[PDB]
From Swiss-Prot:
Intracellular or extracellular location(s): Nucleus
Transmembrane segments: none
Source species, domain of life: Eukaryota
Parent-protein residues present: 77 to 151 of 377
Function text: Transcriptional activator that binds to the consensus sequence 5'-AACAAAG-3' in the promoter of target genes and plays an essential role in embryonic cardiovascular development and lymphangiogenesis. Activates transcription of PROX1 and other genes coding for lymphatic endothelial markers. Plays an essential role in triggering the differentiation of lymph vessels, but is not required for the maintenance of differentiated lymphatic endothelial cells. Plays an important role in postnatal angiogenesis, where it is functionally redundant with SOX17.
Name listed for the protein in its UniProt record: Transcription factor SOX-18
Domain remark in the UniProt entry: Binds target DNA via the HMG box domain.
Entry's disease: Defects in this protein are the cause of the ragged, ragged-like and opossum phenotypes. In all these, missense mutations give rise to a truncated protein that retains DNA-binding ability, but lacks regions required for transcription activation. Homozygous ragged and ragged-like mice are almost completely naked, display prenatal edema and frequently die in utero or shortly after birth. Heterozygous ragged and ragged-like mice are mostly viable, but have a thin, ragged coat. Homozygous opossum mice display no visible phenotype up to 11.5 dpc.
Other comments on record: Deletion of the DNA-binding and the C-terminal transcription activation domains causes no visible phenotype, excepting slightly darker coat pigmentation and a decreased proportion of auchene and zigzag hairs. The mild phenotype is due to functional redundancy with other Sox genes. The phenotype apparently depends on the genetic context: backcrossing the mutant into a pure C57BL/6 background leads to defective lymphangiogenesis and the same embryonic lethality as observed for opossum mutants.
Ranges where the record places region Interaction with DNA: 6-19, 30-42
Organism (species): Mus musculus (Mouse)
Annotated tissue distribution: Detected in adult lung, heart and skeletal muscles.
Encoding gene per record: Sox18
Record's subunit section: Interacts (via C-terminus) with MEF2C (via MADS box).
Length: 76
DNA sequence: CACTAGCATTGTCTGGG
DNA sequence: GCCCAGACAATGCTAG
């Protein structure tokens, strides 16, 4: 199989569909601009709106420990 | 034809101080 | 065990 990647955090879990939606609504905007828009929109969400994505990121974090128990993040 | 780095974001994590 | 500076998770075009 392929290399093991980091699990997605709450913002990244949410950004998957939202980036797609923004891209389709604004097909002239590059991903850098979309990212700036996504950052602001994520910050605008209230706690209740963020909750499912926060919860799903934690599930992904725990599952990553199960599927890849000896994984160690080694940046450079 | 094929590859590669860069861009931007939030949140999590690293090594070394 | 916090600080510092930064990598890297997804995305997909741009351009070399």
């Amino acid at each position: 199989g392929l290399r093991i990647r980091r699990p997605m955090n709450a913002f990244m879990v949410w950004a998957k569909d939202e980036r797609k939606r923004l891209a389709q609504q604004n097909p002239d905007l590059h991903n850098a601009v979309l990212s700036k828009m996504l950052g602001k929109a994520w910050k605008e969400l209230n706690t209740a709106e963020k909750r499912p994505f926060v919860e799903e990121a934690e599930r992904l974090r725990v599952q990553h420990l199960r599927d890849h128990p000896n994984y160690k993040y080694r940046p450079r």
